[PDB]
Amino acid sequence: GSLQLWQFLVTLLDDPANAHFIAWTGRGMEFKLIEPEEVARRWGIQKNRPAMNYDKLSRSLRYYYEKGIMQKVAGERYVYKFVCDPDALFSM
Protein backbone atom coordinates (compact mmCIF):
# COMPACT_ATOMS: atom_id res chain seq x y z
CA GLY A 1 0.00 0.00 0.00
CA SER A 2 2.94 2.37 -0.49
CA LEU A 3 2.36 5.23 -2.92
CA GLN A 4 4.20 4.89 -6.24
CA LEU A 5 5.21 7.82 -8.42
CA TRP A 6 3.32 6.45 -11.43
CA GLN A 7 0.18 6.20 -9.28
CA PHE A 8 0.61 9.74 -7.95
CA LEU A 9 1.04 11.10 -11.48
CA VAL A 10 -2.15 9.38 -12.62
CA THR A 11 -4.02 10.95 -9.70
CA LEU A 12 -2.68 14.40 -10.62
CA LEU A 13 -3.65 13.88 -14.26
CA ASP A 14 -7.24 12.81 -13.55
CA ASP A 15 -8.00 15.86 -11.38
CA PRO A 16 -8.66 19.04 -13.42
CA ALA A 17 -7.62 21.14 -10.43
CA ASN A 18 -4.04 20.26 -11.49
CA ALA A 19 -4.42 20.97 -15.21
CA HIS A 20 -2.44 24.23 -15.09
CA PHE A 21 0.76 22.35 -14.16
CA ILE A 22 0.25 18.76 -15.43
CA ALA A 23 -2.13 17.46 -18.06
CA TRP A 24 -2.78 14.68 -20.52
CA THR A 25 -1.80 15.87 -23.99
CA GLY A 26 -4.52 13.87 -25.69
CA ARG A 27 -2.21 11.49 -27.58
CA GLY A 28 -2.24 7.99 -26.14
CA MET A 29 -1.04 8.09 -22.55
CA GLU A 30 1.24 11.10 -23.07
CA PHE A 31 1.27 13.90 -20.53
CA LYS A 32 3.12 17.17 -20.11
CA LEU A 33 4.66 18.61 -16.97
CA ILE A 34 3.51 22.17 -17.59
CA GLU A 35 5.23 23.18 -14.33
CA PRO A 36 7.85 20.45 -13.76
CA GLU A 37 8.95 22.03 -10.48
CA GLU A 38 5.39 22.20 -9.12
CA VAL A 39 4.89 18.51 -9.96
CA ALA A 40 8.18 17.72 -8.22
CA ARG A 41 7.17 19.76 -5.15
CA ARG A 42 3.85 17.94 -4.84
CA TRP A 43 5.49 14.52 -5.14
CA GLY A 44 7.82 15.65 -2.35
CA ILE A 45 4.91 16.65 -0.12
CA GLN A 46 3.03 13.43 -0.85
CA LYS A 47 5.96 11.02 -0.42
CA ASN A 48 7.45 13.06 2.48
CA ARG A 49 10.87 13.89 1.00
CA PRO A 50 11.79 17.52 0.56
CA ALA A 51 13.70 19.10 -1.01
CA MET A 52 12.25 17.36 -4.04
CA ASN A 53 12.78 19.31 -7.27
CA TYR A 54 12.54 18.47 -10.95
CA ASP A 55 16.21 17.45 -11.10
CA LYS A 56 15.52 14.80 -8.44
CA LEU A 57 12.11 13.91 -9.93
CA SER A 58 13.80 13.34 -13.30
CA ARG A 59 15.95 10.61 -11.69
CA SER A 60 12.78 8.74 -10.73
CA LEU A 61 11.44 9.17 -14.26
CA ARG A 62 14.71 7.79 -15.65
CA TYR A 63 14.25 4.84 -13.30
CA TYR A 64 10.81 4.27 -14.81
CA TYR A 65 12.37 4.52 -18.26
CA GLU A 66 14.92 1.81 -17.48
CA LYS A 67 12.19 -0.35 -15.94
CA GLY A 68 9.82 -0.07 -18.94
CA ILE A 69 7.16 1.87 -17.03
CA MET A 70 7.45 5.33 -18.62
CA GLN A 71 9.04 6.88 -21.68
CA LYS A 72 10.20 10.41 -22.38
CA VAL A 73 8.66 11.60 -25.65
CA ALA A 74 11.45 12.60 -28.01
CA GLY A 75 11.32 15.99 -29.69
CA GLU A 76 9.46 17.27 -26.62
CA ARG A 77 10.97 18.64 -23.43
CA TYR A 78 8.72 17.77 -20.47
CA VAL A 79 6.40 15.27 -22.18
CA TYR A 80 6.31 11.67 -20.96
CA LYS A 81 4.07 8.67 -21.46
CA PHE A 82 2.97 5.59 -19.55
CA VAL A 83 3.91 2.36 -21.30
CA CYS A 84 1.67 -0.02 -19.36
CA ASP A 85 -1.93 1.20 -19.05
CA PRO A 86 -2.25 1.88 -15.30
CA ASP A 87 -5.94 0.98 -15.30
CA ALA A 88 -5.29 -2.29 -17.12
CA LEU A 89 -2.77 -3.30 -14.46
CA PHE A 90 -5.66 -3.77 -12.01
CA SER A 91 -8.75 -4.27 -14.18
CA MET A 92 -9.27 -7.96 -13.39
Curated annotation (Swiss-Prot):
Top-rank taxon, per record: Eukaryota
DNA-binding residues (ranges): 3-83
Localization terms from the record: Nucleus
UniProt tissue specificity: Ubiquitous.
Family, as annotated: Belongs to the ETS family.
Function recorded in the entry: Binds to DNA sequences containing the consensus nucleotide core sequence 5'-GGAA.-3'.
Subunit structure: Interacts (via C-terminal) with ZMYM5 (via N-terminal 120 amino acid region).
UniProt protein name: ETS translocation variant 5
Species: Homo sapiens (Human)
Span covered, complete protein: 366 to 457 of 510
